[PDB]
Ligand binder design. Structure first.
Ligand SMILES: Nc1ncnc2c1ncn2[C@@H]1O[C@H](COP(=O)(O)OP(=O)(O)O)[C@@H](O)[C@H]1O
Ligand SMILES: Nc1ncnc2c1ncn2[C@@H]1O[C@H](COP(=O)(O)OP(=O)(O)O)[C@@H](O)[C@H]1O
Ligand code: VO4
Ligand code: VO4
Ligand SMILES: [Mg+2]
Ligand SMILES: [Mg+2]
Lengths: 587, 587
């Protein structure tokens, strides 16, 4: 069953592996834990000893030596109540190393997973939820591991010794009944604990949303301030707390009732034997004062079984709380690299389609019967009314989603066979919407080729028509862009983005509605420079202002998921089709 | 004594305020704690008497009655160490209600103080810091309110009893000596810890930036997948762990040294006491065994002081964490209402500028001597090369920032006097870059006037032009736009907002940049339908695509922080000014 798989994987990250130095530190700590109880029991023996020594009034040397030994061992024991003693503390301080290892490995695991799911799962997420799961997750493991070694192993070993012992002290068969009693006690408390899982699960899956209403709301500050707000949002946030309030108060209370009902049954189970002894005593059939054995008997079962019960609840809570993470760690990727493939041989660069169809949700065909080819060194442009499907034709060629029928070829090879890691090398895009890392421009613009020196980056942004404005800034390049990169400007953000790709100097360039959001003037230059410095030719560019693709080699028009009519500029203008109407309306 | 001020705010929310029902639950819990201690001490006396009276002979139902009473007394006892008794659990379960109250009244506080800071602080934040610093704060308060009810108060009360008691048992002046000795002990243990506190702030600050790498990276998938990564992002993420990891190492060890070394003082003190006792016993005056009396006296000084000390370090840690939290509350709004402000009177919406000067950080002038007036019912259009500062002029009229000289008047009235709460109600704005809440279209487009019903919103979006394309979607008005609304489309993401403002129906409108994404055709229709709404309402529109403002009422050109030339389209073109150059190059 499932429990199997979970545990197995869990086998590794629980027990330190591969680093023998941290392999050993668990054992020393375990052994010191073992030594602690023995020392605690041993100390009173020497206390009694010194007592008698005192009694006889022995010479000062022997009594002083015994005093020194006693104080030595009392210091090493630590003194009971708070275990605030040497041998006890050394455990914690030598534990603070192995815990850090297993806390690092879990967290730096799932993070390396969130950057490999396909783009669809990214768009569909809700940032609050995914941000929270990691927080509750890692705490679960770092709690389980620091809880399994201190308590469960010692108690279990002690009780198994207790059952192995006393077998010869009583009859030979006495061990079997004790083992069966322990097993039967265990199996009874299992069925009763299913009263908990439903409420904990409800808590948890309702807590995630009440995080989403926070981080989602705070994320877009400008929208909540433009329209009048700040009294709708606080109110709505409160009304999501009360639900979580009520749903907790059931789960927390349901623990205490289960705790008391566990205790009471054991208490009256022992009271039955006590009343049996009372019946035997008082001259009913005997006056035996055998309470010496019975009084010892109640503790030796009251401690271990209640202790064993009150921990199994803790472990059950920890797994049911963990349960949510496993999912974000098993949702497999989508687009997949066909096992066994290599780099995509690269030549001057020729891309072609043939008979591609693609649908987002099977409700309707987003793209039907697309077919177009481009020769190296030429420029191909798309123009269409909003939503017709300009963005998707470009977004497929970079292989986020996956084709349905037909095929896409780069320079004579399919893209399905070639590994996807290489395909990202030669293709550079500038996105429809730009985002920036919250860091200074100098670090942000070099991000394409980390090796690049501090002169070439200056050379690149100069060709992008942005350099002359930046130097006039106060503080120079050390200026900070600010969160999500809107503090900088309204348009210069686009120019920074367009410099990013120029730095990388890829093979093929896929500008997308890039020239917009600028001004009619600077555009001419960006284009001109981009041209001279066009890197490797083969460029596809989707733009709306027709005054920027007038001289492109080939032009396409997309009405709805299908090519309408194609040609060059002057030749297609006289045709008098829809493109003619767009141009005429664009005065 | 800033500590003086800080405390109040603590006293405000710790002890329940204003709610007598949750006022009472503190006293019941405290009293139950006390009676728990009383039961724990009382039971053995009961047990000893029952054993003695049962021991001899001859019970007549008295043994049974006493045994049953004993069993229930044990049931209420809880058996000491485990606290698994009907008294101990009642404490926790009646503690759940009051704690949750404090946990709420803190978290909902700062969330309503985090939507009132002005815009500049927001553009300067790091989402990691602000999202984390709340989580630590809302844990510190509920943690601190645990100790000052369960642990510290009982121990302090016990010390007060122990010092008032034994005053008749010994000389009266003894209590003064004991009090002075305890104060002297406390005086040293403060100085030893304060060395530690300058060594936790480094940990806590260093954690913030590490959180900054996570959320800020995960906040933009596109820019980390378009180029190649996961061989740089993970690698850099590890580094911001190792630094943190080592810093925690160097901290949490300092607790162990400064917890053991305190013990060694007490151990040496007890060694000195025992050695003096032995020297006195060894026939110095007599073989009197005074050690039995002395040891109990010594343990009296031992435990009510070691316990007092070891509950002084947790308090210090808790105030370090709250110390990092308070700073977010002390910050003040950059702009604040002038006290005693009357709501604005709105007649026709004429707006007037008078010699405004404004800069962001005193490095350079951003706007110089702007002067323009528009009468009601007209259209003003700004056109100029990027970075000149049209966006700032638009952002200023809404009172986000504040002016430096001169004033701006709305309907012949200053805006320095009127409270900002009224001003934002009349004005409608569609932003430069759109954002969306992660919820269905029906929720985002409705957000303008929550009262408005399902009919008016449907009628409204028709004027926008989005209506036809929506129903072609599967699921209609209940589709999901996903996080930050980049799943919808490229163009429609603006048409939604341009419907939102129409729904609010303000007095005056400030379209920042409508026709950037929308294509050419859908434009003409949106412009025509927008005019049909009402010719009376005044609008400010700033558009790079120069076609859309051909026939506006009057036009301004901004070169750099200053007006250049003003006039209507037909007359100004013949002037042959810079506007002529822009238009001619555009054609
Ligand atoms: N992730 C998605 N989820 C739902 N619908 C989508 C998604 N991506 C694209 N679409 C649909 O496909 C169309 C894509 O058109 P697109 O080429 O983006 O238009 P534009 O060129 O204006 O950006 C949109 O109209 C949208 O309805
Ligand atoms: N929040 C800010 N902090 C500092 N400087 C800013 C801020 N916002 C804008 N600026 C500077 O002031 C100018 C504002 O120009 P803006 O009106 O945004 O130009 P555009 O309209 O072309 O986007 C920009 O050049 C930018 O350098
Ligand atoms: O706000 V702009 O950079 O499009 O003038
Ligand atoms: O909405 V667009 O057709 O400019 O990608
Ligand atoms: Mg702007
Ligand atoms: Mg698009």
């Amino acid at each position: 069953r499932d429990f199997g798989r979970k545990l197995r994987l869990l086998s590794g990250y629980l027990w330190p592996r591969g680093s023998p130095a941290l392999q050993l530190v668990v054992l020393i700590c375990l052994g010191l834990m073992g030594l602690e109880r023995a020392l605690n029991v041993l100390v009173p023996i020497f206390y009694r000893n010194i007592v008698n020594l005192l009694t006889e009034k022995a010479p000062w040397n022997s009594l002083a030596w015994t005093v020194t030994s006693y104080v030595f061992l009392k210091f090493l024991q630590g003194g009971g109540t708070g275990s605030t003693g040497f041998v006890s503390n050394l455990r914690t301080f030598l534990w603070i190393r192995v815990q850090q290892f297993t806390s690092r490995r879990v967290e730096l695991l799932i993070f390396s997973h969130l950057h490999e799911l396909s783009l669809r799962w990214h768009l569909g997420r809700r940032t609050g939820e995914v941000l929270r799961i990691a927080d509750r997750g890692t705490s679960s493991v770092t709690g389980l591991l620091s809880y399994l070694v201190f308590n469960v192993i010692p108690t279990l070993a002690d009780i198994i010794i207790g059952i192995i012992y006393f077998s010869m002290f009583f009859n030979a068969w006495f061990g079997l009944i004790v083992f069966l009693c322990m097993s039967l006690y265990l199996t009874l408390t299992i069925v009763v604990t299913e009263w908990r899982t439903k409420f904990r699960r409800a808590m948890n899956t309702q807590e995630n949303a009440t995080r989403a209403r926070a981080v989602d709301s705070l994320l877009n500050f400008e929208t909540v301030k433009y329209y009048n707000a700040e009294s709708y949002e606080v109110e709505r946030y409160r009304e999501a707390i009360i639900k979580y309030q009520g749903l907790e108060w059931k789960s927390s209370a349901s623990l205490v009732l289960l705790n008391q009902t566990q205790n009471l049954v054991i208490g009256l189970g022992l009271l039955a034997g006590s009343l049996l002894c009372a019946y035997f005593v008082t001259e009913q059939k005997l006056q035996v004062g055998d309470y010496v054995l019975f009084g010892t008997y109640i503790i030796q079962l009251y401690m271990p079984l209640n202790a064993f019960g009150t921990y199994y609840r803790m472990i059950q809570t920890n797994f049911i709380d963990m349960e949510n993470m496993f999912d974000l760690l098993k949702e497999e990727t989508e687009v997949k690299d066909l096992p066994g493939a290599g780099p995509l041989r690269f030549q001057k660069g020729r891309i072609e389609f043939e008979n591609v169809h693609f649908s987002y949700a099977d409700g309707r065909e987003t793209l039907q019967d697309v077919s177009f080819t481009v020769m190296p060194g030429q420029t191909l442009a798309l123009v269409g009314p909003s939503g017709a499907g300009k963005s998707t034709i470009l977004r497929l060629l970079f292989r986020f989603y996956d084709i349905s029928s037909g095929c896409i070829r780069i320079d004579g090879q399919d893209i399905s066979q070639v590994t996807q890691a290489s395909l990202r090398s030669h293709i550079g895009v500038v996105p429809q919407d730009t985002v920036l890392f919250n860091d200074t421009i100098a670090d942000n613009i070099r991000y394409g080729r980390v090796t690049a020196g501090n002169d070439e980056v200056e050379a690149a942004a100069q060709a992008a028509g942005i350099h002359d404005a930046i130097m006039a800034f106060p503080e120079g390049y050390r200026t900070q862009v600010g969160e999500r990169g809107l503090k900088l400007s309204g348009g210069e953000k686009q120019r920074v983005a367009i410099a990013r790709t120029i730095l990388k100097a890829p093979g093929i360039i896929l500008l997308d509605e890039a020239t917009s959001a600028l001004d009619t003037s600077n555009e001419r230059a960006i284009q001109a420079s981009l041209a001279k410095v066009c890197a490797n030719r083969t460029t596809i560019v989707v733009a709306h202002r027709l005054s920027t693709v007038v001289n492109a080699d080939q032009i396409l028009v997309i009405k709805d998921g299908c090519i309408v009519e194609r040609g060059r500029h002057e030749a297609l203008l006289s045709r008098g089709g829809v493109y003619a109407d767009m141009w005429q309306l664009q005065q």
